[PDB]
């Protein structure tokens, strides 16, 4: 499952929870890519916390949006990545073990 929620001037939270199917990656890629191309989004906080498993397309889902953000000088934060995830991404975005309010407070500063 997943939820999207505009939470701040151009900032979007993607909560991932449970099992993210290849089909969901697709629903997500649709709404966010649109949002970026529309200029409604320039910062994505991906909340990975509750996630138990995504298939490989989630990895591209995230990296795609990054390449999309790079061009609008946007930014990505990976929030609460487990082991593989942070390893998968390290070998890059910003990873911070925090809450969403925390993550967002942090984004407002800059």
The CA distance from 21 to 73, in Å, is 29
What resolution, expressed in A, was reported for this entry?
2.7
CATH 3.30.750.24 fits 1-110, yes or no: yes
Residue 20 bridge partners (DSSP): 54
* Among 25, 29, 65, 30, residue whose Cα is nearest residue 45: 65
Residue written as token pair 């390449």:
67
DSSP annotation string for 44-75: EEEEEEEEEEE-THHHHHHHHHHHHHHHTT-E
What's CA 41's distance to the chain center, in Å?
Answer: 11
Beta strands in 1-110 (DSSP E): 2-8, 11-20, 43-54, 75-79, 94-95
Close Cβ partners of 19 (under 8 Å, ≥ 6 residues apart): 52, 53, 54
Cα dist from 35 to 5, 11, 41, whole Å: 12, 10, 5
Structure tokens, 84: 């593989």
CA torsion, points 31, 32, 33, 36, in degrees to nearest 10?
Answer: 130
Listed by start position, the domains of the chain span 1-110
CB atoms within 10 A of CB 57: 18
Method used to determine the 3D structure: X-ray
- How distant, in Å, are the alpha carbons of 5, 50, 64, 65 from that of 44? 10, 17, 12, 9
């Amino acid at each position: 499952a997943f939820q999207l929620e505009m939470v701040t001037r151009e900032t979007v939270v993607i909560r991932l929870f449970g099992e993210l199917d290849h089909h969901a990656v697709e629903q997500i890629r649709a709404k966010i890519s649109t949002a970026i191309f529309q200029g409604a989004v320039t910062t994505i906080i991906w909340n990975f916390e509750r996630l138990s498993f995504m298939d490989s397309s989630g990895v591209g889902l995230v990296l795609g949006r990054m390449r999309e953000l790079e061009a609008v000088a946007g930014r990505t934060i990976l929030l609460n990545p487990s082991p593989t995830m942070r390893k998968v991404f390290q070998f890059g975005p910003w990873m911070m073990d925090a809450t969403e309010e925390e993550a967002i407070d942090r984004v407002r500063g800059i």
